[PDB]
Symmetry: D2
Subunit: 94 residues, 4 copies
């Protein structure tokens, strides 16, 4: 009875261990799978933000081009205002 | 003699017509002067208003450029939190591969 | 009699001076006409160039607005990847609290 | 000798188990700590992106205001161009 109980226990522990290591291997593999998917959703969010980064770099360059164009328009209007001021003052002298 | 009375009357006709012409000319000249004065003042007022509005627009574009720079700064810090996140998830990946 | 020769000579003096004045007036008038023509053509050319440049600037601002919208779309998708990341890290947090 | 070996083994397994559960509790706690820090770096990146979101909403509103202002400038220039065209044509008629 004693050695029968001890042999029965040893087989139970042997079965428990194999079931333990198999679950421990499944845990380590699912932690790998769920972490990878997280890593691209990390990296994809990074690359989509970097795309936006360089779009606003382009937007700032285009704002500077627009600013030069309006500055040239203003210089033409200053010239025109000068010429029209001379004509106004001439009419005032008549 | 007799032609002398036609001379005198021609002269008198001429002086009446010169006076009439002087009045007609002065009225026409003052109307064209007024019309030219009003058009000159309006063209100067218009070009000044247009010019002023453009100076306003340039101030607005200067502000927009400054705000784009702050937006750059804001999106830089967002990239930092994303890189550290990349980093620690990669730390967990490396440690998991080594079991 | 004798005054008649002063009359005739006065008339002759007057006709010479009227002819001189006609020439002087025609030259002055043509110069002021040319000056006014050139200034009018230049003012029209200037305001047309200014106006055209402003139409160019409006096209540029229409483009900038369109690009801001695409930037909105790009940053929306970035928020999606950040929310799902939020979501799965929260999934791991909840599961860890339950041990 | 037999029962001495079996008692010695039982004490070893008892000591191994307590050392196992203590390490298993330390593992579960560090996974909690490292995941939290990851979660704010997630959420802080989210809130800083949302801040940028509403800045560009403001930028688009300001672009529309600027567009109206330039459209009003253009209408003044059209008026001025009309008036100057009439003066040009008048000078051409002289």
């Amino acid at each position: 009875a004693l050695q029968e109980l001890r042999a029965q226990h040893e087989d139970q522990v042997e079965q428990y261990k194999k079931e333990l290591e198999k679950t421990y291997s499944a845990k380590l593999d699912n932690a790998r799978q769920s972490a990878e998917r997280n890593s691209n959703l990390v990296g994809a969010a990074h690359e989509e933000l970097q795309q936006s980064r360089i779009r606003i770099d382009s937007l700032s360059a285009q704002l500077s081009q627009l600013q030069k164009q309006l500055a040239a328009c203003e210089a033409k209007l200053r010239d025109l205002e000068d010429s029209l001021a001379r004509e106004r003052d001439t009419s005032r002298r008549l």
